[PDB]
PDB file of C-alpha atoms in Angstrom:
ATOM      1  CA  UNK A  21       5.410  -2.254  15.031  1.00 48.47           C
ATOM      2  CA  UNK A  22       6.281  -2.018  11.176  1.00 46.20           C
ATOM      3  CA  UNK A  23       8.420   0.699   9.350  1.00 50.93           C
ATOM      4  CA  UNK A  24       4.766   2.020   8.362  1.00 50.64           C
ATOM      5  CA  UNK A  25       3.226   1.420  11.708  1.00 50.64           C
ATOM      6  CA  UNK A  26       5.865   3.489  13.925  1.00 53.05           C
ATOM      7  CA  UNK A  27       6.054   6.463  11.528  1.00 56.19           C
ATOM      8  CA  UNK A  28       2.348   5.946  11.088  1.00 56.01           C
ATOM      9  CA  UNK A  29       2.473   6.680  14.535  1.00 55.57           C
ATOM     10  CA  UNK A  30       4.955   8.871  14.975  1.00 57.46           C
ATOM     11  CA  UNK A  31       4.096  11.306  12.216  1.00 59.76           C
ATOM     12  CA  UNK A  32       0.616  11.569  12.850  1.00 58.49           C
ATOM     13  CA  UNK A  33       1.543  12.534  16.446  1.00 62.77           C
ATOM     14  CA  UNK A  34       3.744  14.988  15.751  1.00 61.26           C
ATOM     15  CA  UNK A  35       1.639  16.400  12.551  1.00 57.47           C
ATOM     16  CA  UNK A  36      -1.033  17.027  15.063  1.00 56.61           C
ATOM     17  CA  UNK A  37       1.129  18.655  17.249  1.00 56.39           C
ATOM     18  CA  UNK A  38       1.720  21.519  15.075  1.00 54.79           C
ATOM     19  CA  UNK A  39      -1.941  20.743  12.745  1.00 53.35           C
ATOM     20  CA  UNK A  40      -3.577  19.716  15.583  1.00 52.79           C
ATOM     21  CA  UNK A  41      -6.768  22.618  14.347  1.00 49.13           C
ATOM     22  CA  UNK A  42      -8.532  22.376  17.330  1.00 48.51           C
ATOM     23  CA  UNK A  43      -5.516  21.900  19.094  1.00 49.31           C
TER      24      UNK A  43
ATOM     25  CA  UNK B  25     -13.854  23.465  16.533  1.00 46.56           C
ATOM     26  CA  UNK B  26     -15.278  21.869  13.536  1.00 46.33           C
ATOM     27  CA  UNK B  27     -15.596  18.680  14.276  1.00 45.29           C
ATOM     28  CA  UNK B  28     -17.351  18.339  11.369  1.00 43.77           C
ATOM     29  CA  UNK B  29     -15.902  20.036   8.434  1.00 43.16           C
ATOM     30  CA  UNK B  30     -16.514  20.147   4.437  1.00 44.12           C
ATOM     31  CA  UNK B  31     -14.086  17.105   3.702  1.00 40.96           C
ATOM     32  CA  UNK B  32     -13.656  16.342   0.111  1.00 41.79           C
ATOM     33  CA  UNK B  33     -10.433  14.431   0.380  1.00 43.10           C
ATOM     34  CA  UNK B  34     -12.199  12.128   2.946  1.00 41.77           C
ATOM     35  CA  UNK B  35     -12.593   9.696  -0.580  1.00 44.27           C
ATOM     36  CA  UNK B  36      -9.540   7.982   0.200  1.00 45.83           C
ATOM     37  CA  UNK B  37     -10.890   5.842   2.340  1.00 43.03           C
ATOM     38  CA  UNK B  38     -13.347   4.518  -0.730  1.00 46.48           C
ATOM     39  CA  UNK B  39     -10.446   4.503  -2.661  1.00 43.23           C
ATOM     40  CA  UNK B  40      -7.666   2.560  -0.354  1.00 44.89           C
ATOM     41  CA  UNK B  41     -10.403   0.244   0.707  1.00 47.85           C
ATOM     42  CA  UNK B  42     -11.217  -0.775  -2.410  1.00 50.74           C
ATOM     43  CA  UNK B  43      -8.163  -0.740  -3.615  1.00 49.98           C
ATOM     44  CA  UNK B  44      -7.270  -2.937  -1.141  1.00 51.84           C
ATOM     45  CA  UNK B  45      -9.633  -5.431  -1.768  1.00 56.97           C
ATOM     46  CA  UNK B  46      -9.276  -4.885  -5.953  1.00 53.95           C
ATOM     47  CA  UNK B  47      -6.218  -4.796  -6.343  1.00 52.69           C
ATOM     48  CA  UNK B  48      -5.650  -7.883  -3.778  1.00 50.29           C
ATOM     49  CA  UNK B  49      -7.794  -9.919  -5.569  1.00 50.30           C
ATOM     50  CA  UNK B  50      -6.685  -8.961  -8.828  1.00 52.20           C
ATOM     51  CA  UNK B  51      -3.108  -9.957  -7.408  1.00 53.50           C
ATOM     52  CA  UNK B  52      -4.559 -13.201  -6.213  1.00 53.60           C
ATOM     53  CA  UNK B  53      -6.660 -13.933  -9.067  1.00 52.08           C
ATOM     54  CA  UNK B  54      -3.466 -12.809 -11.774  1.00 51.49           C
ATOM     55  CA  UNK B  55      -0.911 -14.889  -9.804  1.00 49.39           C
ATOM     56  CA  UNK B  56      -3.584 -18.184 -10.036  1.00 48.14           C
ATOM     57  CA  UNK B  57      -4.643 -16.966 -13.628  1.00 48.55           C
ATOM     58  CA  UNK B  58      -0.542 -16.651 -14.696  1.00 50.90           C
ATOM     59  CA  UNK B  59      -0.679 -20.326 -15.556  1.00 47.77           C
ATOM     60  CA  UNK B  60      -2.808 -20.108 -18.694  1.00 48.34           C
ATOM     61  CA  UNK B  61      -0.677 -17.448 -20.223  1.00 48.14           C
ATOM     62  CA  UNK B  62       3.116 -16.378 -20.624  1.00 48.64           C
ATOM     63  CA  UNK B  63       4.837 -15.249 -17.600  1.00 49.39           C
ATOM     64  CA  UNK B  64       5.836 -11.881 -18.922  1.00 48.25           C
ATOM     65  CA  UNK B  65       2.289 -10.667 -17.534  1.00 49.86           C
ATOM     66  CA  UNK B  66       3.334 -12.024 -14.026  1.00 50.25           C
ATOM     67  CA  UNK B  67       6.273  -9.905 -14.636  1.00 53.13           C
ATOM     68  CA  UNK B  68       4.859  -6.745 -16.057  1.00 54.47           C
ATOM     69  CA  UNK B  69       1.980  -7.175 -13.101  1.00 58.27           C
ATOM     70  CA  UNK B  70       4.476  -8.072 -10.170  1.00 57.95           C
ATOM     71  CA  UNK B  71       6.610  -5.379 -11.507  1.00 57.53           C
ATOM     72  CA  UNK B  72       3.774  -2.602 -11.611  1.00 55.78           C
ATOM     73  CA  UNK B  73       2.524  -3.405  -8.510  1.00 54.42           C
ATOM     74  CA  UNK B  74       5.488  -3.933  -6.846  1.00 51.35           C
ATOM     75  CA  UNK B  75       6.659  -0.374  -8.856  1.00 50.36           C
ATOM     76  CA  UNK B  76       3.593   1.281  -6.940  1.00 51.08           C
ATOM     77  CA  UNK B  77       4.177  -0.485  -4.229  1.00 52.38           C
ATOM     78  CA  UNK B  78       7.356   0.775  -3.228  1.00 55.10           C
ATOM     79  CA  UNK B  79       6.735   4.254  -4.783  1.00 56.77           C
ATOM     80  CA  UNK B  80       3.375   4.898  -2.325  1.00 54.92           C
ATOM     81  CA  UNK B  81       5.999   3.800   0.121  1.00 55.70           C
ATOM     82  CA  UNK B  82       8.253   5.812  -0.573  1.00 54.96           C
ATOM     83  CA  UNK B  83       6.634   8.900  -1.043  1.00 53.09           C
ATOM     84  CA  UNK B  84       4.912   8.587   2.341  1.00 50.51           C
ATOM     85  CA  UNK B  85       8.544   7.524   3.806  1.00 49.00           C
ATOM     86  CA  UNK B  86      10.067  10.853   2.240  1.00 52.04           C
ATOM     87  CA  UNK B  87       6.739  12.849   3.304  1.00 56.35           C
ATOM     88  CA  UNK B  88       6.629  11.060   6.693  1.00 60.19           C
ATOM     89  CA  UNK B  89       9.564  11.802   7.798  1.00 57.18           C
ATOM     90  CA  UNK B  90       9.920  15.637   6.375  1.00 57.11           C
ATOM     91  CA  UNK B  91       6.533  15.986   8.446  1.00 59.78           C
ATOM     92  CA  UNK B  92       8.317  14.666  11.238  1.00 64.42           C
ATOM     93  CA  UNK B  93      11.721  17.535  10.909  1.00 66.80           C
ATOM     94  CA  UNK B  94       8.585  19.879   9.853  1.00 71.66           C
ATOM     95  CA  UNK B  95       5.707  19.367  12.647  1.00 71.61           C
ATOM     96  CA  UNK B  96       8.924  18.976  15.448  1.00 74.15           C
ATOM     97  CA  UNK B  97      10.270  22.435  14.516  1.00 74.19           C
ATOM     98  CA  UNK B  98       6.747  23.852  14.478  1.00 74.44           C
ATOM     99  CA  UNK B  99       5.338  22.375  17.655  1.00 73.58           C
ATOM    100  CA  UNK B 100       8.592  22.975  19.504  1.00 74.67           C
ATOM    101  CA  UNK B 101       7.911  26.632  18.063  1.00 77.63           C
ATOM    102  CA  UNK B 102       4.414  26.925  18.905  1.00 77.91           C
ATOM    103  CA  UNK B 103       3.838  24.483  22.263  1.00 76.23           C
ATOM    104  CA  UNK B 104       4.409  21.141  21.592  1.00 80.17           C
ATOM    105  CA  UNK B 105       1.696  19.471  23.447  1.00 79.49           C
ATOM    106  CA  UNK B 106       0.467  16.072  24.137  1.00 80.57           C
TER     107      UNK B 106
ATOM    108  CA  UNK C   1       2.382 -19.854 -24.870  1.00 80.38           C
ATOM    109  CA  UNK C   2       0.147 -16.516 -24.913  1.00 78.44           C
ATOM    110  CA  UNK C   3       2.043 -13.771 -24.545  1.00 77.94           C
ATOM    111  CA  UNK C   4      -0.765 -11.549 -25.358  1.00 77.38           C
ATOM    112  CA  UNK C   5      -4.328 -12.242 -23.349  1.00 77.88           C
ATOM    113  CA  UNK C   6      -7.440 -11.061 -22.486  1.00 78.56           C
ATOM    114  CA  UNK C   7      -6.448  -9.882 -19.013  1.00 79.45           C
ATOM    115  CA  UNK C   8      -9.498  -7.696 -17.728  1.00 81.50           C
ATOM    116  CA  UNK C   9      -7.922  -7.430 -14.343  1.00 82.62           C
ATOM    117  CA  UNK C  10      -5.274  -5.612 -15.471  1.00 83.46           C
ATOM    118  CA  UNK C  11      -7.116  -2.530 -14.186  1.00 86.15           C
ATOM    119  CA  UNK C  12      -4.949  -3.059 -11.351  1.00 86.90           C
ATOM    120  CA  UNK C  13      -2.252  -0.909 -12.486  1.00 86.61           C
ATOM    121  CA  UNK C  14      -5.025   1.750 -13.161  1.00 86.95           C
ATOM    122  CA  UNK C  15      -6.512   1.562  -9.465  1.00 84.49           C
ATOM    123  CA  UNK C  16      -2.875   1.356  -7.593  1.00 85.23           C
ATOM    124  CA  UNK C  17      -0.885   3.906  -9.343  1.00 82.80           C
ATOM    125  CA  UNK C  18      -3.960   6.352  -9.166  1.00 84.60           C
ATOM    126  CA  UNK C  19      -4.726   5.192  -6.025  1.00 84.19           C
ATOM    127  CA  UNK C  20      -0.950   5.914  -4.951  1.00 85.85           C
ATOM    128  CA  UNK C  21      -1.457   9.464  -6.291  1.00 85.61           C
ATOM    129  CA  UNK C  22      -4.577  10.338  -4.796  1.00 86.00           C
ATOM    130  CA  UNK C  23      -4.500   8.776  -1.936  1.00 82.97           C
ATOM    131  CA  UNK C  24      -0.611  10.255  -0.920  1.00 83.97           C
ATOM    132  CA  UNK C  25      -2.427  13.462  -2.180  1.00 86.03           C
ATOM    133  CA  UNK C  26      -5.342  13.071   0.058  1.00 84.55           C
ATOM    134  CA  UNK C  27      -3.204  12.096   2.965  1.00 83.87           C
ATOM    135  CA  UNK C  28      -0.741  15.127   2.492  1.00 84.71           C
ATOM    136  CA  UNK C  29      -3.794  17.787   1.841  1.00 85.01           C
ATOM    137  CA  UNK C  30      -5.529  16.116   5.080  1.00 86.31           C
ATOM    138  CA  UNK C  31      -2.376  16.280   7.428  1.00 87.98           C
ATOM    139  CA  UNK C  32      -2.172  19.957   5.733  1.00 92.80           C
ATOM    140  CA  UNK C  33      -5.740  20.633   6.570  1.00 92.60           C
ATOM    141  CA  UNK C  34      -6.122  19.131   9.817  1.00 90.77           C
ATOM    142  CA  UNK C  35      -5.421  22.519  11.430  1.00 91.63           C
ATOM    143  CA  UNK C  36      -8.499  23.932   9.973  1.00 91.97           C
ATOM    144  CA  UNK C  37     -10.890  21.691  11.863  1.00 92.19           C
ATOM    145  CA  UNK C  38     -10.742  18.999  14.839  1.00 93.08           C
ATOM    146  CA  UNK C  39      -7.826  16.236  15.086  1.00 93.81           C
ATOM    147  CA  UNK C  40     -10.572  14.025  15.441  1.00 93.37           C
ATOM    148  CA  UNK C  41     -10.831  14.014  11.542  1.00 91.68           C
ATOM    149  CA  UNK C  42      -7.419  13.406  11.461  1.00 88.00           C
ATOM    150  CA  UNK C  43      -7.609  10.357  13.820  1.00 92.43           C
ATOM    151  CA  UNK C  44     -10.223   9.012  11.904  1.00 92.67           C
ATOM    152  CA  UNK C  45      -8.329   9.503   8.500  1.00 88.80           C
ATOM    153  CA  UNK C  46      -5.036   8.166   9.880  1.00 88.25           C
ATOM    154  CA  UNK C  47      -7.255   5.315  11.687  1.00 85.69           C
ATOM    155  CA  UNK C  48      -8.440   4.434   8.286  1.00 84.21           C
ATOM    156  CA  UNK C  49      -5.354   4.816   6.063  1.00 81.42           C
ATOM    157  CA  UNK C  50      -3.534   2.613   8.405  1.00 84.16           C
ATOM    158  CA  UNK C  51      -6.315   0.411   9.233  1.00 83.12           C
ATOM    159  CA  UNK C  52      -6.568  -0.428   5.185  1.00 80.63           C
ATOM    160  CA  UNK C  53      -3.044   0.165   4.599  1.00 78.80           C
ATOM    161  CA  UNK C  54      -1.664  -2.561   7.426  1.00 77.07           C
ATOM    162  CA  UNK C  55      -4.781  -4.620   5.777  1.00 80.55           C
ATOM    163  CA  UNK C  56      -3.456  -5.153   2.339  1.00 76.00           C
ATOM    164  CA  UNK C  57      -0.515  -5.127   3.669  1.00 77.51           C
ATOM    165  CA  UNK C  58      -1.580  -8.223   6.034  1.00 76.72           C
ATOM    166  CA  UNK C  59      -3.340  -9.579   3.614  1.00 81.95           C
ATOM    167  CA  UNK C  60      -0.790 -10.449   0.599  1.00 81.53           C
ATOM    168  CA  UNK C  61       1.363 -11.419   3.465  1.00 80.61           C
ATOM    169  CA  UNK C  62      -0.573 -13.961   4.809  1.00 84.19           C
ATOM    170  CA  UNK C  63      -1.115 -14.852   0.904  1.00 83.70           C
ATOM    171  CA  UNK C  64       2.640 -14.458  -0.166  1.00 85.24           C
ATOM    172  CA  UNK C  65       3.375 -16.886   2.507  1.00 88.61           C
ATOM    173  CA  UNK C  66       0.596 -19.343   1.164  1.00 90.55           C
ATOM    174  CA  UNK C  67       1.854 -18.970  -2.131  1.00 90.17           C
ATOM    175  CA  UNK C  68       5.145 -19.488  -1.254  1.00 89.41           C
ATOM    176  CA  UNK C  69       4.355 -23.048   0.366  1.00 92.52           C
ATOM    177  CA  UNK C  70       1.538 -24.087  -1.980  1.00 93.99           C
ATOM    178  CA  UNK C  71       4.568 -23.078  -4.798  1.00 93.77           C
ATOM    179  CA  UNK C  72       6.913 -24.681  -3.368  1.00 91.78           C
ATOM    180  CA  UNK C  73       5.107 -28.030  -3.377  1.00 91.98           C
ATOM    181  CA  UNK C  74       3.435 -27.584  -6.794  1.00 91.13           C
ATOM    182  CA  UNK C  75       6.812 -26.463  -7.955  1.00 91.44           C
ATOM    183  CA  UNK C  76       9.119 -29.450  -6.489  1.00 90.32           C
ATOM    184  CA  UNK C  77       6.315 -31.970  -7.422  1.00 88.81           C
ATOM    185  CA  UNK C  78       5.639 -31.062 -10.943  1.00 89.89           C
ATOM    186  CA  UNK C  79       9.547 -29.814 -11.776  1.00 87.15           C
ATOM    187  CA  UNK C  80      10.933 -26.620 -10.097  1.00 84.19           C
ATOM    188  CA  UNK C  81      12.813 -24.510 -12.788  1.00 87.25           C
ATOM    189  CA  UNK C  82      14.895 -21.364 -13.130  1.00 87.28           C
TER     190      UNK C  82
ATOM    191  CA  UNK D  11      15.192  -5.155   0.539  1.00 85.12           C
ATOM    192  CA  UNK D  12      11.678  -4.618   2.914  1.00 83.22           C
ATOM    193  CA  UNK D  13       9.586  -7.123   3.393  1.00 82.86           C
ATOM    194  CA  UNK D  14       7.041  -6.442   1.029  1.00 85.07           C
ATOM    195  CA  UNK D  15      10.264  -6.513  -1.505  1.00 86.86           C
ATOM    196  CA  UNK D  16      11.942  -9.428  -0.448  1.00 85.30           C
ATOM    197  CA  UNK D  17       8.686 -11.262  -0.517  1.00 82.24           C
ATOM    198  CA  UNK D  18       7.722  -9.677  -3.544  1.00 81.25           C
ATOM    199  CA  UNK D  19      10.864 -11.314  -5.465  1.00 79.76           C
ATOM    200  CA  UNK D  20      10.656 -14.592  -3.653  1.00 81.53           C
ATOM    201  CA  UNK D  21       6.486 -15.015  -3.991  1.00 78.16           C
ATOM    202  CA  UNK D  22       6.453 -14.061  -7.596  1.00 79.15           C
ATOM    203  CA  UNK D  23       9.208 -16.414  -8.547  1.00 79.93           C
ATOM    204  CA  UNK D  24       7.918 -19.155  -6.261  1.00 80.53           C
ATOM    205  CA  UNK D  25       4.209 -18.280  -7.903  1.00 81.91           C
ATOM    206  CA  UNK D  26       5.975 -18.204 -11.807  1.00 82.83           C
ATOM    207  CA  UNK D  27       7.922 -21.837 -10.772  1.00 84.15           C
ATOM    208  CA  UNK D  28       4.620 -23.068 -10.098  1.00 85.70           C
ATOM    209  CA  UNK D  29       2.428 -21.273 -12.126  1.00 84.03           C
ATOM    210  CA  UNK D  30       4.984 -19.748 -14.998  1.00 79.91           C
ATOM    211  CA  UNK D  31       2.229 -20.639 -17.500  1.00 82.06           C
ATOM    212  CA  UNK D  32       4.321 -20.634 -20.953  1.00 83.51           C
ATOM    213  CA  UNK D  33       6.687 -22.690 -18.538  1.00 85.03           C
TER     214      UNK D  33
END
């Protein structure tokens, strides 16, 4: 997984884990 | 929840995708076309899109991993779930 | 040579600098308002910014590589400069 | 230098030795 693939990843998991909304 | 909601920033998939397929081709097309003209537009072109290349990079880099330090903190705050 | 040309897809550094702009701004505002509605909409919008984003990506690879062998042989064949 | 750099630099002058047009 590339630089933008991992934090793709990464980020977007952990941005939904606090801004999940319907969490 | 709204699983449907008023999105009005949902245009950036219009916009990346074509983008994507614009801006490629317009790439492709420049780099074939380069050899009718002077290669300071290959260098002006490789060097804006290159430019833009690494500075959408970059800002999602910086905002990427700030969300990361940001959404951590928060969802160990709140309930970090999975 | 021409310096100066015609160039009508030059709009390229129109579409990727804007694109960078509104795009970053419609991926911030959308990982900002996520938490207003269901993470499916974020799913989706991180499916398709990566989807598009690992396709351009892909796709100048796969032609950068091209390039660089099709170059390389035009280049060494018809006389290879610096 | 990423990838997309590195290959920036090395496609563009590869392209240019090729294709440099005023050559």
């Amino acid at each position: 997984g590339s630089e933008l693939n991992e934090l793709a990843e990464f980020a977007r998991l952990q941005d939904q884990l606090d801004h999940r909304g319907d969490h | 929840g709204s699983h449907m909601a008023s999105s009005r920033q949902k245009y950036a998939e219009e916009e990346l995708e074509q983008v994507r397929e614009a801006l490629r081709k317009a790439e492709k097309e420049l780099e074939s076309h380069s050899s009718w003209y002077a290669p300071e537009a290959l260098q002006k072109w490789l060097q804006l899109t290159h430019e833009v290349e690494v500075q959408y990079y970059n800002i999602k880099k910086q905002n990427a991993e700030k969300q990361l330090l940001v959404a951590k903190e928060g969802a160990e705050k709140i309930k970090k779930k999975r």
